[PDB]
Ligand binder design. Structure first.
Ligand SMILES: *[C@H]1O[C@H](CO[C@@H]2O[C@@H](C)[C@@H](O)[C@@H](O)[C@@H]2O)[C@@H](O[C@@H]2O[C@H](CO)[C@@H](O[C@@H]3O[C@H](CO)[C@@H](O)[C@H](O)[C@@H]3O)[C@H](O)[C@H]2NC(C)=O)[C@H](O)[C@H]1NC(C)=O
Lengths: 439, 49
């Protein structure tokens, strides 16, 4: 028997689905998502890291003039400064006083740290969805790990589980992401080869080990101070270091829908988005015939207490007369009320206790136990606590669900006015009919 | 659960208050004043003898 149901993509919240195969006793499966992972396919555009500026010992050409040469190094700059009169600890370096030039050159290289400290600029593509589901089957809860793509069926305990596709293609990751370590950021990083000084991407390489380096640091060489051999320059500070200080919050802290973000691989986990279709192939051996199953009669329901606490704050006691010893599935006939127990044991004439959770001030629901339905009703109180550390076990209330006492007041007032109108309408109709008749 | 009730200041007479907390069986507490003391703050003016 192939059973197809849809559950919310909320993780850590169990949902009950009723399996109804005609001729067989109803069965209830409890399914809970333990983990949902969206893993984007990534393509690396480039690596951003701190740059180092390399400045070879300056060449001082004494009693003559130096010349520049053009090199292909990533951000090479070279200039000749005339009129230099450098001194060393032991005195003047050059014999000539004015016929002396200094050849200063510099270039930018990726630092030695770029193999460890770097940020990777990735392009994100359609994610592969995966999920871990806990299913309570035949009284035994089995963990199923499968891809949420409507394919890649996984069979456990001779039952085939197909999960997905996801009802939503939403992902916390944009087309362009940057990964530093455990922190993933959504930013429109610049094109490769088009980085800007002082900003993220000022120095770029395709891979950490690549020798192909782009750099735009505005490395302008300046004239040395008199009497010295130092090589001054004006260069924008690494945009990587600036970025590290100005990163802001990562997606782990900013993502919508409570998504958890992790790296290695990049993952979005437990996003409360949309829902997940599930199809279960249940073997015939898993079903008990209606004639073989216990049958209940003379059922009645009472509710000693109810609080709409969102934590199974209601308890119902149901009296029954069982035809024989055995087990019965239990299912709520309304979304308004969620019952914690999926199955109970029934023995002769006795009573069963089940817990339930509802948002309703007045709990009006029907409970089906192995094909026999009993109507339950209760007045539910509000909780005293304002805040809890767990998601509601029940669904939303809606406008259609109002307390019985309030409903009575609404009908009394509505009927009161409606009756006055009906009377006034009748009076006018009678007068019009009489006025019409007379001529 | 905070329960607020009021009893007479009469001493030696037990009073019963019902603590009705929905979801739990009703609890009844019996309270009796054994002693009530009003101790005035005094400032000595003088001694007569
Ligand atoms: C199969 O397992 C599920 C889930 O239980 C979780 O996973 C297990 C492998 C263990 O690691 C558990 O520790 C873990 O919670 C069972 O459902 C859950 O069972 C636990 C108890 O094992 C319930 O928690 C208890 O709740 C009572 C309430 O009064 C507390 O007093 C206890 O201290 C404890 O917290 C938990 O509520 C329940 N889940 C739900 C939604 O009710 C499941 O019963 C089990 N099935 C079988 C056949 O083993």
């Amino acid at each position: 028997y192939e059973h197809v149901t849809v559950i919310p993509n909320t993780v850590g919240v169990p949902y009950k689905t009723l399996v109804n195969r005609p001729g067989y006793s109803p069965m209830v499966l409890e399914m809970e998502l333990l983990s949902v992972t969206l893993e984007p396919t990534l393509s690396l555009d480039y690596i951003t890291c701190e740059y180092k500026t390399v400045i070879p010992s300056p060449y001082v050409k004494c009693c003559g003039t130096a010349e520049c040469k053009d090199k292909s190094l990533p951000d090479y700059s070279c200039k000749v400064f005339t009129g230099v009169y450098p001194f060393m600890w032991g005195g003047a370096y050059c014999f000539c006083d004015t016929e002396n030039t200094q050849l200063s050159e510099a270039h930018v290289e990726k630092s030695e740290s770029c193999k460890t400290e770097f940020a990777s600029a990735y392009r994100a593509h359609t994610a592969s969805a995966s999920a871990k589901l806990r299913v309570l089957y035949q009284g035994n809860n089995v963990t199923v790990s499968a891809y949420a793509n409507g394919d890649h069926a996984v069979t456990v305990k001779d039952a085939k589980f197909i999960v997905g596709p996801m009802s939503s293609a939403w992902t916390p990751f944009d087309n362009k992401i940057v990964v530093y370590k455990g922190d993933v950021y959504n930013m429109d990083y610049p094109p490769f080869g088009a980085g800007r000084p002082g900003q993220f991407g000022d120095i770029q390489s395709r891979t950490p080990e690549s020798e192909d380096v782009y750099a735009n640091t505005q490395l302008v060489l300046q004239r040395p101070s008199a009497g010295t051999v130092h090589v001054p320059y004006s260069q924008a500070p690494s945009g990587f270091k600036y970025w590290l200080k100005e990163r802001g919050a990562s997606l782990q802290h900013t993502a919508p829908f409570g998504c958890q973000i992790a790296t290695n691989p990049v993952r979005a986990m437990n996003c409360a988005v949309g829902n997940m279709p599930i199809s279960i192939d249940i073997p015939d051996a898993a079903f008990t015939r209606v004639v073989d199953a216990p049958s209940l009669t003379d059922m009645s329901c009472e509710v000693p207490a109810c609080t709409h606490s969102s934590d199974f704050g209601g308890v119902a006691i149901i009296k029954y007369a069982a035809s024989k010893k055995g087990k019965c599935a239990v299912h709520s006939m309304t979304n308004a009320v969620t019952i914690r127990e999926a199955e109970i044991e029934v023995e002769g004439n006795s009573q069963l206790q089940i817990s339930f959770s509802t948002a309703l001030a007045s709990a009006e629901f029907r409970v089906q136990v192995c094909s026999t339905q009993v109507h339950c009703a209760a007045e539910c109180h509000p909780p005293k606590d304002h805040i809890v550390n767990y998601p509601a076990s029940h669904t939303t209330l809606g406008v259609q669900d109002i307390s019985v006492t309030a409903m009575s007041w609404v009908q009394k007032i509505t009927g009161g006015v409606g009756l006055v109108v009906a009377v006034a309408a009748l009076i006018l109709i009678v007068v019009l009919c009489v006025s019409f008749s007379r001529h």
